[PDB]
Amino acid sequence: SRHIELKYPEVFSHGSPFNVPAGFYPNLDHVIEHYRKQHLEEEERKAKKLAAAAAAA
Amino acid sequence: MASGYGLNGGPSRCFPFWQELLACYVTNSSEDNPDGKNKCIPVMEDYYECLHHRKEAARVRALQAAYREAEAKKLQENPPTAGQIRNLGLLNKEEDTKKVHCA
Amino acid sequence: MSYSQTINSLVEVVLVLVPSLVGIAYVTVGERKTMGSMQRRLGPNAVGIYGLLQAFADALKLLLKEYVGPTQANLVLFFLGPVITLIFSLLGYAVIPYGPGLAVNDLSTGILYMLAVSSLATYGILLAGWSANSKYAFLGSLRSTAQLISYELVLSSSILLVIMLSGSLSLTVIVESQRAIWYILPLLPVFIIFFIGSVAETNRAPFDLAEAESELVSGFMTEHAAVIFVFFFLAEYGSIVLMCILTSILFLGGYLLINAPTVEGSFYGLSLGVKTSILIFVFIWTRASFPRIRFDQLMSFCWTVLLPILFALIVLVPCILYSFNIFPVNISLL
Amino acid sequence: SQISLLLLKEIYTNGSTHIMLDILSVLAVISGICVIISKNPIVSVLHLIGLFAYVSFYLILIGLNFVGLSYLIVYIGAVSILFLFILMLINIRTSELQSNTSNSIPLTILVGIIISSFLFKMLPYGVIISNKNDLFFITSKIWDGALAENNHISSIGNIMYTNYNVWLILASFILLLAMVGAIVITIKPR
Amino acid sequence: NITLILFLIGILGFVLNRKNIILMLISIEIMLLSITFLILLSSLNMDDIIGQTYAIYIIVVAGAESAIGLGILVAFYRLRGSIAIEYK
Amino acid sequence: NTPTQTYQFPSKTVKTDYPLIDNDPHFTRVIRYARPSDYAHGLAAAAAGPAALWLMERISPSQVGRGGFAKAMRLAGFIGLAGGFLYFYQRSILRFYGMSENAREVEMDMREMTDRVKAGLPLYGESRLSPAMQGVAARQSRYSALFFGVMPWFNFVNHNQHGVDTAKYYQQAERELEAERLAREQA
Amino acid sequence: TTPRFWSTPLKYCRWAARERPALFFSVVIGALGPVTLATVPPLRRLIGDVDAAPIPLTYPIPPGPRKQLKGYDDDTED
Amino acid sequence: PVPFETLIPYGIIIAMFGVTGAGMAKVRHMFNGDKRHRWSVDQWDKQQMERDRRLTGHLRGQTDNPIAPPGFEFNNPWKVXXXXX
Amino acid sequence: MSAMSIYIIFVSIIAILFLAIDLIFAPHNPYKEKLSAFECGFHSFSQSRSPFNISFFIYGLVFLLLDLEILLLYPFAVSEYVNSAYGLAAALIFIGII
Amino acid sequence: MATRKPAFNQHVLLDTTPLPDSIPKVKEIGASSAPLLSASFFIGARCKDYNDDYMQCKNENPGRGEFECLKEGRRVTRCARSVLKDINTHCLEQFRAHWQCLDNNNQQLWQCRPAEWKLNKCVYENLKLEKVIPDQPKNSTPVHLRQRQIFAHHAIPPWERPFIPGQPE
Amino acid sequence: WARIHLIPLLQAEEDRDHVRRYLADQAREKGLLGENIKVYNSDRYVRPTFAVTPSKPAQE
């Protein structure tokens, strides 16, 4: 793979909370949407596997 | 710089440029398409430009040589003295300000 | 501004240096006259009326006394050390507030500035003593190095406990913070410890090991004569007053009171001087009361008594602050 | 016709002169040389503390007041201790007779130029600036970023104990090993 | 630019030194100083407090190194009796 | 009372076998959700270290002086207690990390939290610390029991950044609020 | 002579106070900190002593949509 | 009895501190325009003092005039330096 | 020009002016016995430039590191309002290991 | 220009060029530092919405606030000129009495409490505006309404009383 | 809180100055360099690090 996935995607929440100029920080709503999708997808994937075992019982 | 923490306790001046490059990579690069990250190239040059300033150093060099060679050649009538410049926008120095602004 | 920058800077430096160098001359006469009273003596009373010209005769006598450069001595260093000690001792007066911000430099980090200037001036003592290449001056310089390995951590530890209350590192803000209470009341153990370290920091008795006359002949200054000796004396006595000022800055409210600007500014100046003069007396009283400690015992006293107690306060004091919701805001306010 | 650009000298509120950084810079290199070419280990260590003082004064003049004072505070005590070890572990007289030859000058020139040429490109535009049309840095003011301006010592304190506390914890372990190791190897055996 | 010049002094004062091991240990102190200076000067250009934080941690480990060095040097001297480095 | 946004912060997604409940659980939850097996294993692990140093003494004596072995027991006793508590904490938090079978934990998580919703109280509780300080705390301790072999760390901060969409709790409680009202109607 | 802590902790604490006071009382003063952190805050909030709100260190940007303000427009300038 | 000659050098030391406090305050009260000086100044105050020079010519001059003097939109100073960015 | 810069100048000129007077208006008559080392009146072995035991050098090593430790505590002192509880814990963890 | 604080600034650069006719002109506020601090809590009490609208616009256009929120900035300047005029036409003596004390007192509000308590009651009964500071501890009396100021060099006089709106003498 | 009230009318004046000089430089470049070269790929305003100055300060 040449694609790097961040070990720490929480670096998107970094930055000083003090002396912030207005409009200094970029709007990263799309990044949060992407990370939410990954969490929903992985959890959805996980819920569709432990139910197959219930079927295969 | 990339951290988000500057010298006055406020945020680093190149942090918005770093967050856009990270945002661009995460939201364009993927396993399905290795080449989405080519969208990140202009975003990457800007982060380096806010860090080192080579392109803004190059523009000011060009314009500054162009500017001085024009003002040097340009006709000169009367130089506004430093005292006149110091009197710009004062309370009772209307004459000095008008001379400075040539209005 | 109204007049020149350079002139304002000029007269402010003069108003700080000149009255301080006059104040240094009188601490030397005052110590000689104070111990004598404790010793049932008089002290200087014949060089000027009531002996008030004695320090000037001593000063003038030495600047007209022959300098000797020993053959065994590294001479450039033999002169460099006293010059370093004098300049870097007198620099410490450049951040003293004689009123709110009435300092030659109202620096945001004037406490660290004082630690840097004091540490650099002791290195002159070390260098001058070694440079002499005589046994007693060699033994004197080694004691001065042992002494700074003893008191420097003690002062730096002590001051960090004051900065936890003030939150500033600026000398005026610490004084302004004491309008709530003088720091000698809540920080009473720290005041004793800082005062003890200041006596050791100044090589004053009972910690006069580097220049002890009953063990070494003059210690580090034994080969030093004329102006070189006088550089080391002005450094020492100027250090005494400066450490008394700093102790008054950090624990006794500094300038806080116990044409119109002139009348008010005078009260700040007197108030700082009165509290400094009391602490100057405590030094002289201390030299007159106690025997000299042994240098092994001073190192063990700072390192197994003082520092262990100071580290435990460094833990305890912020725990009291968070518990009572009294961490100071670290913004610019006072 | 139109002036449109006014260069005015700043009356007050003006900064220092940048000439002094060139004075401190040359003295810092001069002093660095003398630390290694001097025949006596005490003038060598005297030049050492002078080198740190010039580097520290440079740091104060560029506005890095805490690190410059912190450098001078820590390296004066350190140099004083280094002095103490030269007295104990070096014969001063025999070392002042420890004359060296310049058979290593040709190596110096080659090794000097080759590293310097290679690392000159590694350093960035921010630093290589100011090595008849010069550039001038322009600064202005903001109010949103000035509501509570902190001092650099406070800006580091704002994060040294929360965001980057792992470095503090590791730092502490290095100091602990030095406090234990440096004593285990030099303690009087009894 | 003073960063390279200082770094070259400490590198040769370490490798070209024919006097004693305290001067060896001094020249390391010079190299670290020049690197810290490069990091401190860059951090002011990029508005980064992290570079000053990085600098402060190179000072703390540079003092830890010099204490471990002086401790090892004493151990070696007690047994060898000279910390002079010998050529010919 | 829907927040209209249930994933405020970007979080790391890990490929694990079981469902993720909380990547940064509070210390009280790790203790509360610990199974009786976790007490049993941690207690045995704490006993293992001084019992090991006892057997080494019995089979191969150290030939130590008169009071040295009792001193060594006190150190071995502590290190096993410290090592066995980290073992017990790690066993419960993995069920929170989705890295162990956690069917019991999921249901008692869905009950506790949906109770907090209908009570109107904050899911993860209230914090004296500032919102940014909470972030630093979440980013220092999330998934941090994976490093217990090297550096221990426990979450004592009530923060809202736990890596899970909170919609399922709200989406759930209202259904318990829908059925409660209907059941009250027929009375 | 000197007691051992693990044999008789109280006789050791008496000996440590009398014979090694600077070291022993360092441990008391230092330990008093974590005792302060565990007892003062609960009792302070018990008696209504409320920790103050954090002071603003950055402009407090209001949340929610903009308020659709009418007034102070360009026409009002003259 | 009281050895008052012993106390005279302490009276002189105190007076010199009084001279210094009196001197500093007067020369800065003069330098700031017959006005008490400023202390504990941050980037906000330094900027506000320069915005007073923009309206009055004196860094410490004050105007309650609600309207700016004409040309105030142009005298906003931009600082120029050769080296320390 | 700033008060600090002139302050440095004046203290140095005073260090020069005092020194210059003594270098000019005092007699200078150097001879062999005047220029010898002081040893209470008897000449002895010159051995101040040879290695000398220091019985307190272990203090100098530990002094080196505890200075680094108290300097690392000074940013906390000037940042307590923001460090608060979470930052206090790390400062206590650091001072406990030290 | 950069927000870095200069260390070697020996020169100043100006620009006589005016904003283009396409941008509406706004007369800038002419008040200096001491008057603006004495009127700040009255600017806030009248122009909060406009101040809050400017900043929310800038946070709505990151990196572009200077060029895309100009109308809001003109609105704040106009709103804040209204209070300055209002204070002038109705509190001129008290307003000057306060910000002059502030100029002599390091712009420290606690150092000029008797002048604030007079100016505030004049503003409250004339411009109907009232100083409000959020999240002040409820147990303790507000610091701007405390009779005794601990950090004031000159003690607040017993005769001078703090001003609370809605309470008579 | 007293500073927070002053911040928007002060930052509104600073922005008018910043936009007044940026627009002025954009004109001064199209008239001297023929066009406006781009230092930044983005449309975001960046506070100038370098400024063109005249070759001489006011005569005084």
Side-chain angles (χ1 to χ4, degrees), chain A, chain B residues 2-103, chain C residues 1-257 259-334, chain D residues 3-99 103-130 134-189, chain E residues 1-86, chain F residues 2-177 179 181-184 187, chain G residues 1-77, chain H, chain I, chain J residues 2-166 168, chain K residues 1-59:
Chain A
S1 180
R2 60 184 68 186
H3 163 59
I4 307 283
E5 215 150 324
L6 304 185
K7 289 168 164 165
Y8 181 68
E10 268 90 351
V11 71
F12 276 114
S13 288
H14 282 205
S16 186
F18 314 114
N19 297 338
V20 176
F24 169 97
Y25 284 114
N27 186 314
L28 310 166
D29 183 48
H30 55 119
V31 195
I32 320 296
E33 154 206 347
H34 161 102
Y35 286 120
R36 196 184 80 96
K37 185 63 168 300
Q38 191 186 175
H39 172 70
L40 258 308
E41 278 291 335
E42 163 84 20
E43 297 307 325
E44 184 187 0
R45 183 199 61 87
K46 274 190 268 175
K48 281 190 284 190
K49 186 178 181 293
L50 57 86
Chain B
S3 71
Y5 304 94
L7 303 170
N8 74 60
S12 62
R13 53 175 196 90
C14 287
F15 196 56
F17 274 134
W18 177 251
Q19 293 281 271
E20 193 196 334
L21 186 55
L22 287 186
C24 191
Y25 193 88
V26 172
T27 49
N28 296 111
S29 174
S30 52
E31 181 40 50
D32 265 336
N33 173 34
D35 292 331
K37 63 181 183 176
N38 310 348
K39 191 180 289 292
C40 307
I41 310 279
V43 193
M44 199 184 55
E45 188 172 351
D46 290 339
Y47 168 71
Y48 287 127
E49 181 53 32
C50 170
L51 227 63
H52 309 307
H53 312 287
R54 308 195 86 258
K55 303 178 62 188
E56 172 199 10
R59 177 188 162 278
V60 172
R61 293 181 184 271
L63 189 154
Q64 184 178 2
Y67 174 100
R68 292 180 180 177
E69 66 183 1
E71 311 314 294
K73 210 168 303 178
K74 197 175 183 179
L75 296 174
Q76 197 279 328
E77 58 276 20
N78 272 312
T81 77
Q84 292 168 354
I85 313 302
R86 256 78 164 257
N87 292 350
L88 188 75
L90 284 194
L91 183 62
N92 213 0
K93 311 300 281 186
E94 281 95 343
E95 311 287 335
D96 272 329
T97 293
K98 297 193 68 63
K99 161 69 192 59
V100 172
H101 284 336
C102 195
Chain C
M1 301 307 189
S2 318
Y3 53 102
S4 166
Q5 203 48 24
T6 300
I7 301 299
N8 173 260
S9 164
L10 166 63
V11 310
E12 293 202 332
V13 167
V14 175
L15 288 157
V16 160
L17 284 173
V18 167
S20 303
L21 283 168
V22 176
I24 304 316
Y26 291 96
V27 174
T28 74
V29 68
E31 151 147 65
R32 289 166 64 180
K33 274 208 89 64
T34 300
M35 293 178 98
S37 304
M38 311 204 159
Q39 288 171 6
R40 314 293 304 266
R41 311 190 280 118
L42 309 171
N45 76 7
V47 186
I49 48 162
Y50 298 126
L52 277 296
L53 269 191
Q54 175 79 264
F56 308 112
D58 296 6
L60 186 49
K61 183 263 287 180
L62 289 166
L63 265 73
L64 301 163
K65 181 70 177 291
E66 159 190 73
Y67 77 92
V68 162
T71 81
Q72 299 301 81
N74 277 136
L75 233 54
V76 190
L77 313 194
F78 181 84
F79 267 65
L80 196 45
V83 178
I84 278 179
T85 312
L86 178 56
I87 296 169
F88 277 108
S89 308
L90 286 176
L91 275 189
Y93 292 74
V95 294
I96 297 316
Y98 298 85
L102 285 188
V104 164
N105 194 356
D106 187 17
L107 197 55
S108 275
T109 43
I111 275 293
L112 291 187
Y113 165 85
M114 295 191 76
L115 295 174
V117 296
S118 70
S119 61
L120 217 165
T122 62
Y123 185 65
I125 293 181
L126 169 56
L127 186 83
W130 178 87
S131 312
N133 199 335
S134 95
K135 311 240 171 53
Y136 288 103
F138 178 84
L139 293 167
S141 80
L142 283 177
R143 278 171 172 206
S144 189
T145 313
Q147 197 152 178
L148 77 94
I149 298 167
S150 302
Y151 64 66
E152 207 229 26
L153 257 48
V154 163
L155 290 202
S156 77
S157 184
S158 288
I159 302 188
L160 168 74
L161 283 149
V162 165
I163 326 298
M164 294 167 175
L165 303 196
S166 68
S168 181
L169 271 187
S170 146
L171 269 83
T172 181
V173 179
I174 300 176
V175 177
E176 290 299 325
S177 301
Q178 299 176 81
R179 294 182 177 266
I181 190 59
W182 288 3
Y183 287 162
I184 189 191
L185 277 296
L187 294 189
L188 192 156
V190 186
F191 167 80
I192 291 152
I193 300 177
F194 183 80
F195 187 79
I196 284 163
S198 176
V199 188
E201 198 270 340
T202 50
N203 237 298
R204 273 285 291 185
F207 318 104
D208 46 325
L209 327 172
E211 209 257 327
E213 47 187 356
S214 317
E215 292 157 44
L216 317 162
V217 204
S218 270
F220 66 97
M221 62 187 40
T222 324
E223 283 303 50
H224 299 268
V227 57
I228 320 300
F229 183 68
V230 112
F231 282 4
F232 274 131
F233 244 177
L234 189 57
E236 182 191 343
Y237 275 85
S239 295
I240 299 176
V241 169
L242 185 60
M243 294 299 291
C244 295
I245 297 166
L246 184 66
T247 316
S248 296
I249 292 319
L250 311 171
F251 295 98
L252 317 173
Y255 47 83
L256 282 193
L257 276 296
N259 210 3
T262 302
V263 175
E264 166 159 355
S266 296
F267 291 146
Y268 282 147
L270 301 182
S271 193
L272 185 54
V274 173
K275 288 179 268 192
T276 300
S277 292
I278 289 163
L279 275 181
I280 286 179
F281 178 92
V282 181
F283 267 63
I284 300 151
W285 193 11
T286 286
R287 185 179 68 189
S289 312
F290 309 112
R292 191 174 299 106
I293 208 171
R294 201 172 70 234
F295 92 94
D296 62 357
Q297 300 164 336
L298 172 55
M299 290 198 109
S300 171
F301 174 54
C302 304
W303 269 107
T304 82
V305 168
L306 297 184
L307 277 178
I309 279 155
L310 277 172
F311 274 106
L313 287 183
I314 275 168
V315 182
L316 176 76
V317 174
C319 293
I320 307 166
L321 298 179
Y322 175 76
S323 291
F324 284 100
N325 204 217
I326 53 160
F327 277 143
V329 290
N330 303 107
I331 69 171
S332 311
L333 178 73
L334 307 169
Chain D
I3 314 299
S4 305
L5 270 186
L6 299 179
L7 212 172
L8 185 62
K9 180 178 298 182
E10 209 168 344
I11 186 170
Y12 299 77
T13 62
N14 55 283
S16 161
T17 80
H18 71 272
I19 301 299
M20 187 66 204
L21 294 175
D22 268 347
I23 311 302
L24 290 163
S25 70
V26 179
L27 281 182
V29 171
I30 285 156
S31 161
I33 310 303
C34 282
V35 175
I36 54 186
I37 70 175
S38 281
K39 291 174 71 175
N40 172 257
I42 302 289
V43 292
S44 168
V45 74
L46 174 69
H47 282 276
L48 178 76
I49 182 63
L51 162 69
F52 282 98
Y54 307 134
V55 169
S56 152
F57 302 156
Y58 189 118
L59 289 170
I60 290 151
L61 277 171
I62 74 191
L64 266 50
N65 294 95
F66 170 75
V67 63
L69 285 177
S70 296
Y71 235 108
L72 197 62
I73 279 175
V74 149
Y75 286 103
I76 292 164
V79 160
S80 298
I81 294 315
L82 216 52
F83 194 112
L84 193 87
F85 277 82
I86 291 146
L87 294 201
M88 177 167 63
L89 305 180
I90 287 165
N91 204 306
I92 288 294
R93 202 188 60 179
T94 62
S95 84
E96 288 175 316
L97 301 158
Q98 207 186 5
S99 62
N103 63 347
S104 42
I105 301 299
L107 188 153
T108 311
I109 309 298
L110 263 175
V111 167
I113 62 170
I114 276 163
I115 297 169
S116 46
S117 165
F118 286 168
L119 318 171
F120 187 74
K121 66 189 188 303
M122 319 208 182
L123 255 76
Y125 204 64
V127 190
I128 43 178
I129 286 297
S130 73
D134 295 343
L135 287 189
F136 294 96
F137 300 93
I138 192 79
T139 71
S140 64
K141 69 177 64 178
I142 53 171
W143 298 98
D144 311 12
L147 170 69
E149 168 244 342
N150 291 46
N151 308 312
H152 298 179
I153 181 183
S154 186
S155 314
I156 286 166
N158 283 343
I159 62 170
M160 160 178 271
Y161 310 92
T162 55
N163 306 82
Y164 304 93
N165 69 23
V166 143
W167 298 341
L168 183 71
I169 297 164
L170 276 296
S172 82
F173 269 70
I174 305 164
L175 289 150
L176 193 61
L177 164 77
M179 293 176 73
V180 171
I183 296 317
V184 74
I185 60 191
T186 62
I187 199 56
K188 314 290 277 188
Chain E
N1 188 39
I2 187 191
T3 58
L4 282 71
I5 301 299
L6 281 196
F7 182 68
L8 302 172
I9 293 159
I11 193 66
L12 314 184
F14 182 84
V15 190
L16 282 300
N17 169 24
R18 283 86 183 255
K19 291 175 184 290
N20 59 50
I21 306 150
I22 295 193
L23 207 53
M24 294 298 290
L25 165 71
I26 279 183
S27 296
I28 280 152
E29 299 182 10
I30 293 175
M31 285 182 279
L32 296 173
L33 156 79
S34 83
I35 304 311
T36 303
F37 203 17
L38 175 59
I39 299 156
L40 283 162
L41 277 166
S42 296
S43 314
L44 173 64
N45 298 164
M46 315 183 284
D47 188 41
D48 200 3
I49 208 52
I50 289 323
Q52 299 190 26
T53 308
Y54 189 21
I56 283 160
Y57 283 123
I58 296 158
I59 300 155
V60 77
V61 305
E65 173 181 31
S66 59
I68 290 313
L70 286 171
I72 284 166
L73 198 40
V74 162
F76 167 89
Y77 177 92
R78 291 209 215 271
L79 297 162
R80 186 138 323 267
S82 179
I83 64 162
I85 61 172
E86 294 191 18
Chain F
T2 303
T4 76
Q5 181 61 247
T6 56
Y7 193 92
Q8 310 270 174
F9 307 95
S11 82
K12 181 60 185 180
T13 280
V14 190
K15 164 80 173 302
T16 70
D17 308 338
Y18 306 83
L20 170 70
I21 295 161
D22 194 327
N23 68 22
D24 213 354
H26 194 273
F27 179 93
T28 64
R29 293 177 64 88
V30 181
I31 310 295
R32 185 155 71 247
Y33 284 42
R35 319 197 158 156
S37 68
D38 306 335
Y39 291 103
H41 286 55
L43 283 176
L53 191 71
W54 189 87
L55 181 56
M56 277 180 283
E57 196 59 32
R58 197 64 189 269
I59 305 185
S60 50
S62 40
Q63 312 299 134
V64 68
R66 297 195 196 281
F69 184 77
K71 174 188 189 99
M73 266 295 111
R74 279 193 294 272
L75 191 46
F78 175 81
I79 288 172
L81 187 153
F85 180 84
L86 285 155
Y87 181 51
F88 151 99
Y89 193 91
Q90 216 170 359
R91 296 195 68 204
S92 168
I93 211 168
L94 255 58
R95 308 191 193 98
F96 269 115
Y97 285 173
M99 307 188 183
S100 172
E101 196 299 319
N102 63 355
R104 172 190 93 111
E105 291 56 24
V106 179
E107 198 175 348
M108 65 180 288
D109 185 74
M110 294 299 291
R111 179 71 275 171
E112 183 178 1
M113 286 314 190
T114 61
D115 300 353
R116 304 223 48 180
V117 185
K118 45 186 45 173
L121 301 179
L123 291 162
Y124 310 101
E126 284 183 4
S127 182
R128 273 79 52 99
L129 304 182
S130 85
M133 261 314 110
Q134 288 170 203
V136 187
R139 299 183 316 255
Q140 154 119 245
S141 47
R142 59 88 174 173
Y143 292 127
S144 72
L146 301 172
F147 204 61
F148 269 3
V150 191
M151 168 151 84
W153 202 267
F154 314 93
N155 186 26
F156 292 95
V157 177
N158 290 330
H159 56 72
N160 54 326
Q161 184 195 299
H162 294 264
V164 278
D165 232 17
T166 45
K168 54 179 174 192
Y169 311 121
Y170 294 90
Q171 292 174 355
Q172 166 74 51
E174 62 197 358
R175 191 191 304 141
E176 301 164 337
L177 288 203
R181 171 183 61 187
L182 269 295
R184 282 203 300 269
Chain G
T1 50
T2 292
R4 301 197 292 282
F5 169 89
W6 298 109
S7 288
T8 50
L10 301 174
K11 198 182 92 213
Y12 181 96
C13 297
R14 200 217 164 201
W15 167 88
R18 295 177 63 87
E19 304 313 317
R20 313 266 189 290
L23 288 179
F24 163 85
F25 278 107
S26 300
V27 182
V28 175
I29 296 155
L32 265 182
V35 189
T36 314
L37 287 183
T39 61
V40 176
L43 170 70
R44 257 189 64 254
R45 179 175 291 103
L46 191 67
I47 61 171
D49 200 329
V50 176
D51 172 358
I55 73 140
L57 293 184
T58 190
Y59 192 99
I61 300 285
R66 290 158 74 173
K67 279 161 86 77
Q68 259 290 311
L69 294 174
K70 304 197 311 301
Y72 299 110
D73 290 354
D74 299 333
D75 61 324
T76 77
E77 174 72 38
Chain H
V2 170
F4 77 93
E5 293 83 3
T6 303
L7 317 169
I8 288 171
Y10 293 103
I12 286 173
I13 297 169
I14 280 156
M16 295 299 102
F17 277 92
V19 160
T20 293
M24 294 299 291
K26 175 72 192 173
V27 305
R28 268 222 309 273
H29 180 272
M30 185 64 72
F31 205 44
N32 286 270
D34 306 330
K35 292 162 154 306
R36 174 151 63 250
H37 64 285
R38 301 294 301 274
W39 61 93
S40 304
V41 172
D42 56 9
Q43 191 50 220
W44 181 278
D45 313 322
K46 277 175 198 63
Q47 285 180 17
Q48 285 278 7
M49 276 177 290
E50 285 165 332
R51 202 184 156 267
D52 288 1
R53 197 203 269 163
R54 291 174 61 195
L55 297 145
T56 74
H58 194 242
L59 277 155
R60 287 286 323 273
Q62 312 281 340
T63 157
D64 57 88
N65 185 27
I67 302 298
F72 173 79
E73 30 186 341
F74 302 99
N75 52 32
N76 192 23
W78 271 20
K79 301 294 186 291
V80 163
Chain I
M1 166 174 51
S2 72
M4 186 66 204
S5 44
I6 296 89
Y7 189 94
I8 290 160
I9 302 166
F10 286 171
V11 300
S12 301
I13 64 170
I14 301 302
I16 282 302
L17 188 153
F18 286 169
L19 184 63
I21 290 150
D22 206 313
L23 292 174
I24 301 299
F25 288 93
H28 200 252
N29 308 99
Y31 58 88
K32 175 193 283 291
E33 298 293 291
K34 170 168 295 176
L35 265 54
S36 311
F38 173 77
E39 182 63 285
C40 289
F42 287 94
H43 289 305
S44 196
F45 304 97
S46 180
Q47 64 183 357
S48 279
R49 298 290 183 266
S50 44
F52 182 81
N53 176 67
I54 288 154
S55 52
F56 52 89
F57 71 97
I58 279 165
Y59 281 89
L61 289 163
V62 311
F63 152 79
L64 270 162
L65 310 155
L66 268 170
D67 202 351
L68 299 167
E69 286 149 346
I70 304 167
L71 186 81
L72 251 73
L73 284 179
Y74 257 84
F76 176 84
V78 287
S79 55
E80 279 167 337
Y81 190 87
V82 163
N83 280 314
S84 190
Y86 193 86
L88 172 68
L92 298 190
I93 293 168
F94 168 71
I95 296 165
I97 305 162
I98 298 330
Chain J
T3 83
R4 63 155 190 98
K5 314 169 304 176
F8 297 99
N9 48 311
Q10 314 285 50
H11 297 289
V12 159
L13 186 61
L14 281 82
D15 204 39
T16 59
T17 307
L19 271 167
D21 268 331
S22 76
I23 309 161
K25 299 174 181 55
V26 53
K27 310 172 190 63
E28 306 285 356
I29 296 299
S32 59
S33 59
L36 55 76
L37 172 74
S38 39
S40 63
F41 288 103
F42 308 124
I43 292 160
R46 169 179 303 166
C47 303
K48 196 180 59 182
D49 301 351
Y50 307 91
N51 289 357
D52 291 351
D53 199 35
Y54 185 57
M55 308 290 290
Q56 274 172 338
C57 182
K58 298 190 64 179
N59 275 29
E60 208 176 306
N61 314 98
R64 299 278 327 170
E66 291 93 348
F67 291 86
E68 306 173 359
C69 300
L70 285 162
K71 194 181 179 177
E72 286 70 23
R74 291 194 301 273
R75 217 176 305 127
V76 312
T77 295
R78 274 187 291 264
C79 184
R81 179 196 312 173
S82 73
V83 288
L84 289 155
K85 297 174 69 61
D86 288 352
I87 296 149
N88 280 356
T89 67
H90 279 104
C91 319
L92 197 66
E93 325 286 337
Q94 288 69 240
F95 182 59
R96 292 180 181 177
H98 187 220
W99 65 252
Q100 293 179 356
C101 169
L102 278 174
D103 204 34
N104 296 5
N105 287 240
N106 194 48
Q107 294 193 4
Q108 300 174 171
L109 296 168
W110 62 92
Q111 297 284 9
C112 295
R113 291 265 190 254
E116 159 205 346
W117 300 330
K118 290 171 164 299
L119 157 75
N120 286 29
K121 177 191 175 182
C122 183
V123 175
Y124 173 72
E125 70 194 68
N126 296 328
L127 320 175
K128 291 294 165 185
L129 282 176
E130 55 247 10
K131 172 173 182 175
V132 164
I133 316 158
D135 302 354
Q136 287 182 320
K138 300 304 176 59
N139 34 2
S140 308
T141 308
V143 82
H144 60 300
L145 305 182
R146 283 178 201 177
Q147 176 63 26
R148 285 208 51 180
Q149 296 299 321
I150 300 176
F151 294 100
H153 47 70
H154 282 84
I156 281 71
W159 43 92
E160 296 284 330
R161 328 288 289 182
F163 159 72
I164 299 93
Chain K
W1 280 108
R3 289 188 173 183
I4 274 146
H5 305 322
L6 300 163
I7 277 179
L9 56 103
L10 288 165
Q11 195 63 14
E13 180 200 342
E14 196 60 37
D15 293 11
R16 279 183 292 261
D17 178 66
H18 276 251
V19 164
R20 194 180 52 79
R21 302 184 62 159
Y22 176 86
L23 290 178
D25 215 14
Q26 284 293 292
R28 193 185 317 260
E29 198 148 34
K30 183 179 279 297
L32 292 181
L33 297 186
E35 78 282 347
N36 289 297
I37 62 170
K38 297 177 179 57
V39 172
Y40 283 101
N41 307 310
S42 33
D43 192 41
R44 52 188 324 170
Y45 171 66
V46 184
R47 278 160 180 95
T49 297
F50 304 105
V52 176
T53 79
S55 173
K56 192 177 274 198
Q59 195 56 47

